[PDB]
């Protein structure tokens, strides 16, 4: 995207498991079926 | 998006499990079927 | 969106489980079926 | 995207497991089915 | 993309496992089915 | 891409395993099915 | 691409293993099926 | 590419193993199926 | 390519093993199926 | 290529093993299937 | 190619083993299947 | 090639073994299947 | 080729073994299957 | 070739073994299958 | 070739063994299968 | 060839053994299978 | 050939052995299978 | 040949053994299978 | 040949052994299988 | 031959042994199988 | 869908223009945020 | 859906324009926010 | 989809223009955010 | 899909233009963000 | 896909133009972000 | 795919132009970001 | 693929032009970022 | 592939031009970034 | 591949031009970044 | 390949031009960056 | 390859021109960057 | 290769020109950068 | 190769010209940069 | 090679010209840069 | 080679010209840079 | 070689010209740069 | 060689001209640069 | 050589001219630069 | 040599000219630059 | 030599001219530059 992202960690006293999945999905811009510049 | 995101952690005294799934879904912009610039 | 988001953690004394799913769903912008610039 | 990203670590006292999957999905720009510059 | 990225490490007191996967997916630019410069 | 990337390491008190895989997927530029400069 | 990359190491107190795989995938420029300069 | 790259090492107190693989994949330039300068 | 590359070493207190493989893959320039200067 | 390369060593306190394999793969220039200067 | 290369050594306190293999692969110039200067 | 190459040694305190192989592979110039100066 | 090469030695405190094999491979100029100056 | 070469030695405190093999491979000029000055 | 070569020695404190083999391979000029000055 | 060569010695404190084998290989000029001045 | 050669000796403090085998190989000029001044 | 050669000696403090063999090989001029001045 | 040769000696402090073998090999001029001044 | 040759001695301090074998080999002029001044 | 579709044309006495766009929209199956097979 | 669709044309005596956009909208199946198989 | 489609043409007495765009939109199967086989 | 498609043409009395674009859009199978076989 | 396709032509009394683009879009199988066989 | 395709032509009374492009887009099989056989 | 293809021609009364481009796009099999057989 | 292909011609009354390009694109098998047989 | 191909011609009443290019693109087998048989 | 190929001609009433280019592109078999039989 | 090929001609009533270029491209077997039988 | 080839001619009523080139390109077997039997 | 080849001619009513060039290119066997039987 | 070859002629009613050039290119066996039977 | 060859002629009604060139290229056996039977 | 060859003639009704050139090229056996039976 | 050869003539109704040149080229056995029976 | 040869004549109705040249070139046995029975 | 040769004549109805030149070239046995039975 | 030779004549009807030149060339045995039975 036209902007950024961020993340942060820091400590813990025991075991830690982390799973991260960002932005699942097709589109982030524009989807166009058909465009016509001009007819007659 | 034209804006950013953020996250934060910090500590804990025992085991921690974390699962993250951001922005599930197709679109973040525009979907359009068809456009006509001008007819007759 | 044109606005950001945030999250926070902090500690606990025992095991903690977290599951997060943000913005489930297709659209965040505009959906258009058909547009006509002008006829006759 | 026209913007960057970031990440952060820092220490912990025991074992840590991390799994990261950035931007899963087809499109980040524009998809066009068919475009016509002009007809008659 | 038109912008860069970043990452960060730092130490820990015990074993750490890290798995990283950036930008899984087909497109980061523009996909065009067919384009016509002009007809009659 | 038209921009660079970065990474960072630093020490740790015990064993560390790291696996890195950037930019999985076909396209980073433009894919065009067919283009016509002009017809009649 | 039109831009460079970077990496960083630094020390550690015990054994470290690193595996690096950069830019897996076919395309980094332009792929064209067929282009026509002009017809009639 | 049209830009350079970089890497960095530095020391360590115990054994280190490194495996590196840059730019796996077919294309870094342009692939054209068929191009026509002009027809009739 | 139209630009250079770089690498760096430096010392270590114990044994180090390094394996390096740069730019694995067929193409770094242009591939053309067939090209026509002009027809009729 | 149209640009140069570089490498660096420096000392170490114990045994070091290095294996280097640059630019694996067929092409670094242009591959043409068939080209026609002109037809009728 | 149209540009040179470089390498560097320097000392070490214990044994060192080095294996080097530059530019494995067929082509560094141009490969043409068939070219036609002109037909009718 | 149309440019030169270089290498460097320097001392060491214990034994050193070096194996060096330059430009393994068939081509450094141009390979042509067949060329036609002109037909009818 | 149209350019020269270089190498360098310098001393060492213990035994050194060196093996050098430059430019292994068939071609360094031009290979042509068949050429026709002109037909009809 | 159309250019020259070079090498360098210098001293050493213990035994040294060197093996040198320059320009392995058949061709350094031009190989032609068959050439025709002109037909009809 | 159309250019000369060079070599250099200099002293050493202990024994040295040297083996040198230059330009192994058939051709340094031009190889032609068959040439025709002109046909009909 | 159309250019000369060179070599250099200089002293040494202990025994030295040298073996020199220049230009192993058949051809330094031109090899022609069959040449035709003209046919009909 | 059309050019000369050179060599150099100079002293040494202990025994030295030298072996010199210059230009091993059949051809230094031109080899022709068959040449025809002209046919019909 | 069409050019001369050279060699150089100079003294030595201990025994020296030299073996020299110049231009081993059949041809230094032109070898032709057969020639035809003209046919019909 | 059409040019001369040269050699050089000078003194020595201890025993010296020299063996010289110049231009071993059959041909130094031209060898012709058969030649025809003209046929019909 | 068409040119001369040369050699040099000079004083020596201890025993010296020299062996010279100049231009061993069959041909120094021209060898022809058969010549025909003209046929029919 | 688990069912097919259909279309029909037939004639007209003058010019006819038709534009068709089937099934505008993201989904035809199922979109779900998250599932849990079982907890404690 | 589990049902098919249909369309029909037939003729008219003058110009006719038709624009058709079927099933505009995201969902045709089922959308689920979160589902739990069972807790305690 | 698990079912097929169809289309039909037939004749007309004058010019006809037809534009067709089937199934614009991301999904025809299943999209899953995250699934868990079982926890504790 | 698990089913086929179809199309039909047939003749007309004057010029006809047809443009066809089937199945524009990313997905036709299954997209999964992350799946877990089992945890504790 | 697991099924085939079809097309049909047939004649027409005047000029006809046809443009066909089948299955534009990234995916036709399955895309998985990350899958885990089992954890603890 | 696991199934074949088809096409059909047949005649026409005047000129016909046809342009055909099949299966535009990256994937026809399976794309996986990262897979884990099992952890602890 | 695991299945074949087909095409058909047949005659026409006037000129016909055909352009065919099948299966444009990177993948027809499987693409994997990283796979792990098993960890601890 | 694991299956064959086909094509068909047949006659025509006037000139015909055909251009055919099969299977443009990188992959027809499997592309793998990195695989691990097993770790600890 | 593991299967064959085919083609067909047949006659025509006037001139015909044909241009054919099969399987343009890098890969028909397997491309692997790196493989590990086993670690610890 | 592991299967054969085929082609067919047959007659024609007027001139015919044919150009054929099979299997353009680098690879038919297997390309491997680096393989490891086993580590510790 | 492990299989053969074929071709066919047959007659024609007027002039015919044919140009054939089989299997343009580097590889038909296996290309290995570097392989290791085993380490420690 | 491990299999043979074939070709066929047959007659024709007027002039025919044929130009044929098989297997243009470097490799038909195996190319290996470097192989190691075993290390420690 | 490990198999044979074949060709065929047969008659023609007017003039015929044929040009044949089989297996143009460097390698038909195995090319190895460097091989090691075993190290320590 | 380990196999033979073949060719065939047969008659013709008018003039015929044939040119044959088999197996252009350097290698038909094995090329090795350097081989080591064993080290320490 | 380790196998024989063959050729065939037969008659013709008018003039015939034949030019034949077998196996142009340096190597039909083994070319080795350097071999080492064993080191320490 | 380790096998024989063959040729065939037979009659003809008008003039015939034949030119035959077998095995042009340097090597039919083995070429070795330098071989060592054993070192220390 | 270790095998024989053959040739054949037979009659002809008009004039015939034949030119034969067998095995042009330097080597039919083994060429060795330098061999060592054993060192220390 | 270690094997014999053969030739054949037979009659002819009109004039015949034959020119024959066997085994042009230097070597039919073994050529050795320098050989050493043993050193220290 | 170690084997014999052969030839054959037979009659002829008109004039016949024959020219025979066997084994032009220097060597049929062994050529050695210099050989050493043993050193120290 | 160690074997004999042979030739054959037989009757002729008209004038016949024969020219024979057997085994032209320097060597039929062994040529040695210099041989040493033993040193020190």
Author numbering:
A (entry chain d), B (entry chain c), C (entry chain 6), D (entry chain e), E (entry chain 5), F (entry chain V), ...: 1 to 40
Structure paper excerpt:
In this study, we report the discovery of a novel J-shaped protomer structure of Aβ40 fibrils, resolved at 3.3 Å resolution using cryo-electron microscopy. A 3D density map unveiled a left-handed cross-β structure formed by two protofibrils, which we had previously confirmed via AFM. Within the fibril core, a twist of 179.2° was observed, accompanied by a helical rise of 2.454 Å, which describes the upward distance that the structure moves along its helical axis with each turn of the helix. Notably, the cross-sectional view (top view) depicted discernible electron density spanning from D1 to V40. Specifically, in the J-shaped structure, the N-terminal D1–H13 segment folds back against the extended portion of the same protomer. The intra-protomer interaction of the J-shaped fibril is characterized by the formation of salt bridges between D1 and K28, as well as between R5 and E22; meanwhile, in the I-shaped structure, the N-terminal D1–V12 segment lacks order, contributing minimally to the density. Moreover, a unique interaction emerges between the S26-OH group at the center of each segment in our J-shaped fibril. Unlike the well-documented C-, I-, or U-shaped structures, this J-shaped conformation highlights an extensive intra-protomer interaction network facilitated by salt bridges formed at D1–R5, D1–K28, R5–E22, and D23–K28.
Aβ is generated through the cleavage of a precursor membrane protein by β-secretase and γ-secretase, resulting in the production of the Aβ40 and Aβ42 isoforms. In essence, fibril morphology is determined by the balance between intra- and inter-protomer interactions, depending on various intrinsic and extrinsic factors.
